[PDB]
Design a protein around this ligand. Structure first.
Ligand SMILES: C[C@](O[C@@H]1CC(C(=O)O)=C[C@@H](OP(=O)(O)O)[C@H]1O)(OP(=O)(O)O)C(=O)O
Length: 424
């Protein structure tokens, strides 16, 4: 595979960028649309849907269970029922949302369904949620990929305790299907350190938009009542995590970058995102339904807690590496990143140090000292965000090439084109 040269920016970047739909919201809409259909309420449409490897693994996942998902561009329609055929086998790829959101759904079928995924996916947390499904009535063969959900046409539900410190999607995947369990579901997260609060909140907000009743008034506890899932039309927002990679270009170059269609009120963590950018003295303005960020002429080291927004770590580490010479930056709250797509703290540390930088893994994060970097080969580890972080570095360091820019297809197949167009 040839490498991808990251274009430099010897002058301030100036651009207007459109990023496609949110991955998290798209895959939640598809699951909720499948439950509505399976319950007999009809077809649903998702407008502004992201088309990417992660959402294609989700819809093929639904098609393996018996549903029908149509559409050619960003408009997808879900219909049919759950009714897996003999030998049914879901390919999870490296998509955590499929690995975590679809086995509960599968418990509604009365046929066996295998789950499998990439070799790299078998190293990601899954056992605690499989135990929970067992405690709820479901026969499950195996405690990791590949495993089998031998459903019985329905699922009693009830109450269940789970340690979700490793991934918030253990809660989301349980909450998304709870409305079709006989008794509904009460879920209790045991212990502490529950990462990615905004994504559990995303699930709760979208469940309510589908008319489901969920009680989240007590931290670490969720109660969902059994009831209908509504057939409705979903409108998908731009992906704000991917927008941060383009915004990062304004920040490091002293430039200006605008994002079209930025939601004024979102189901995503927009508030956390804009604060972080302003921590570095970027000027952030809302204008034209677009968000404009103006980078500072320079910035120093920063301390930032990423517990609620861990998927920002690859782009924010790159920003930290490009701060003024000798700046020290500390990224915290992200031990669970040791189990993402790749172990993101080990990988970021390796690739920054390869470029002559200074990044040290900590028990919950990274400490990074800005130092002159040199050319090299930035490795992606099959991870869309490692790849974009390589692109951010390259804006300010000649000679950087990402080995596998096609890794970006997980959530942004058109990144190379969009990125060229911005820097141009
Ligand atoms: C990691 C990633 O994104 C995640 C998306 C997700 C969700 O429910 O939609 C919740 C979080 O997971 P966790 O609590 O396990 O950190 C996010 O970090 O992708 P993934 O769906 O393959 O796990 C990503 O975009 O980087």
């Amino acid at each position: 595979m040839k490498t991808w040269p990251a274009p430099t920016a010897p002058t301030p970047v100036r651009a207007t960028v459109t990023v496609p739909g949110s991955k998290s919201q798209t895959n939640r809409a598809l699951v909720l649309a499948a439950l509505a259909a399976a319950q007999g309420r009809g077809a649903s449409t998702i407008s502004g849907a992201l088309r990417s490897r992660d959402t294609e693994l989700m819809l093929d996942a639904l098609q393996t269970l018996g549903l029908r998902v149509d559409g050619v561009g960003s408009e997808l329609t879900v219909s049919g029922r759950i009714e897996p055929g003999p030998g049914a086998r879901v390919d999870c790829g490296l998509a955590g949302t499929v690995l975590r959101f679809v086995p509960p759904l599968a418990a509604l079928g009365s046929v066996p369904v295998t789950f499998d995924g990439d070799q790299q996916a078998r190293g990601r947390p899954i056992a605690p949620l499989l135990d929970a499904l067992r405690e709820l009535g479901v026969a499950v063969d195996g405690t990791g990929l590949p495993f089998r959900v031998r459903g019985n046409g329905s699922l009693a539900g009830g109450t269940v305790a789970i340690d979700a410190s490793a991934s918030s999607q253990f809660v989301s995947g349980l909450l998304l299907s709870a409305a079709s369990f006989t008794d509904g579901l009460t879920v209790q997260h045991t212990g502490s350190s529950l990462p990615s609060a905004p994504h559990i909140a995303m699930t709760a907000a979208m469940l309510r938009q589908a008319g489901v009743d969920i009680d989240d008034s007590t931290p670490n506890r969720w109660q969902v009542r059994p009831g209908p899932v509504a057939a409705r039309r979903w409108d998908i927002e731009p992906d704000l995590t991917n927008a941060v990679a383009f915004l990062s270009a304004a920040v490091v170059s002293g430039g200006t970058v605008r994002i079209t269609g930025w939601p004024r009120v979102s189901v995503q963590p927009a508030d956390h995102i804009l604060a972080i950018l302003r921590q570095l003295n970027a000027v952030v303005i809302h204008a034209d339904s677009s968000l404009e960020v103006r980078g500072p002429t320079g910035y120093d080291g920063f301390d930032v807690d990423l517990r609620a927004v861990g998927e920002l770590t690859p782009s924010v580490a790159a920003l930290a590496a490009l701060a003024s010479p000798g700046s020290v930056s500390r990224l915290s709250g992200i031990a669970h990143l040791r189990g993402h797509e790749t172990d993101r703290l080990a990988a970021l540390s390796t690739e920054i140090n390869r470029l002559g930088g200074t990044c040290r893994e900590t028990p919950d994060g990274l400490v990074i000292t800005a130092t002159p970097l040199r050319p090299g080969i930035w490795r992606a580890y099959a991870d869309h965000r490692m790849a974009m972080a390589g692109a951010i570095i390259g804006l300010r360091v000649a000679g950087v090439e990402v080995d596998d820019i096609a890794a970006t297809t997980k959530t942004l197949p058109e990144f190379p084109r969009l990125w060229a167009e911005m820097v141009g």
